[PDB]
């Protein structure tokens, strides 16, 4: 009875050096949640890039919460060519019954300048 977040745009194409920004919108039910940003390595191995609430202790991956309590920007700062890949966001339903329910994944294309 809890909906997963959605991850848009489907295909984000940017020129190298520019910042590429994703939007994961999560309509939380109760504020005991956490959103995570993932990048799929070879053989479907998920690496956590950043998260909200921001740990604040790579800094090129930042998560910003919009004035509405739904939309979030995951922005790569100064995107490189090797940042092209498959990305997705996931919500973990901690306290109680911790469950990672994932969004649909999105593709990032970084083109030559």
């Amino acid at each position: 009875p809890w909906n997963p977040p959605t991850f848009s745009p489907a295909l984000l194409v940017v020129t190298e050096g520019d910042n590429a920004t994703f939007t994961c919108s999560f309509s939380n039910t109760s504020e005991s949640f956490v959103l995570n940003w993932y990048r799929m390595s070879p053989s479907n191995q998920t690496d956590k890039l950043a998260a909200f609430p921001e740990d604040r202790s790579d800094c090129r991956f930042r998560v910003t919460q919009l004035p509405n309590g739904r939309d979030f920007h995951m922005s790569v700062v100064r995107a490189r060519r090797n940042d092209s890949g498959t990305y997705l966001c996931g919500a973990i339903s901690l306290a109680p019954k911790a469950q990672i329910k994932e969004s649909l994944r999105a593709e990032l294309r970084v083109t030559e300048r």
């Epitope: 609430p53 306290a95 911790a98």
Partner: antibody, heavy 117, light 107 residues
Framework: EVQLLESGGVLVQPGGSLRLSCAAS????????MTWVRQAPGKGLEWVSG????????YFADSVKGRFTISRDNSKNTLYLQMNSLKGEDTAVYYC??????????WGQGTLVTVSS | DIQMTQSPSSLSASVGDSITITCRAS??????LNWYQQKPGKAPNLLIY???SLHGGVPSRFSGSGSGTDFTLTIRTLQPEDFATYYC?????????FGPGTVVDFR
């Protein structure tokens, strides 16, 4: 860096009441939930209570529910644990813990609460 | 309630040995295990989250594995600043329950 400073641990007689305070500094306190974890003298770690971070959601263990109250005041970056109907069993070292994820990042050095006559 | 158990209860080893300690849960949690190190008179420190992820600043020799009910902590090259008590803690279901703890001693 991140520091959690517990205060208020004093010798209290059984049946009394005491409120513990945690001074949070080094991170956005309002964005993270918090928990209290106690270690009884000679015993293991036991989870006491948890707060959502915005204060709307509260979680309690069976051993303290109805007797302990979890609260937070993000204005001054302080976490409170109101301990009522104290028992001798409740004598433990109470740790202020940074919640907000699967895992418990940082632990304060704790405050000692002794319940005896 | 999910009851957590650990084995061994106590451990004696010298510097350089490889140590593997286990943690078992009464029912499946599948990743939601944490490993903590407590030194005497001090607050516990986080080592492993999600049962295999290394917390920032923890030496790479510390490693965790396992899913479901059985998990393991591994210390590849034991060093003097590692002799302490280790607890495992499940985060799948409230209330959060800890393991009895495993004491690592100097021999």
């Amino acid at each position: 860096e991140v520091q959690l400073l517990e205060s208020g641990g004093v010798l209290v007689q059984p049946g009394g009441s005491l409120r513990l305070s945690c001074a949070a500094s080094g991170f956005t306190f309002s964005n993270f939930g918090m928990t209290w974890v106690r270690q009884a003298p000679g015993k293991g770690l036991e989870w006491v209570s948890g707060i959502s971070g915005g204060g709307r959601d509260t979680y309690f263990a069976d051993s303290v529910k109805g007797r302990f109250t979890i609260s937070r005041d993000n204005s001054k970056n302080t976490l409170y644990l109101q301990m009522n109907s104290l028992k001798g069993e409740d004598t433990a070292v109470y740790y202020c813990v940074k919640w907000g994820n699967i895992y418990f990042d940082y632990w304060g050095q704790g405050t000692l609460v002794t319940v005896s006559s | 309630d999910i009851q957590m158990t650990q084995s061994p209860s106590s451990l004696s080893a010298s510097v350089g040995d490889s140590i593997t300690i286990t943690c078992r849960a009464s029912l499946s949690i599948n990743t939601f295990l944490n490993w903590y190190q407590q030194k005497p008179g001090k607050a516990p420190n986080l080592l492993i989250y999600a049962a295999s992820s290394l917390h920032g600043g923890v030496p790479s020799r510390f490693s965790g594995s396992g899913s479901g009910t059985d998990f393991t902590l591994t210390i590849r090259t034991l060093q003097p600043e590692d002799f302490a008590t280790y607890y495992c803690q499940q985060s799948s279901n409230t209330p959060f329950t800890f393991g009895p703890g495993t004491v690592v001693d100097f021999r």
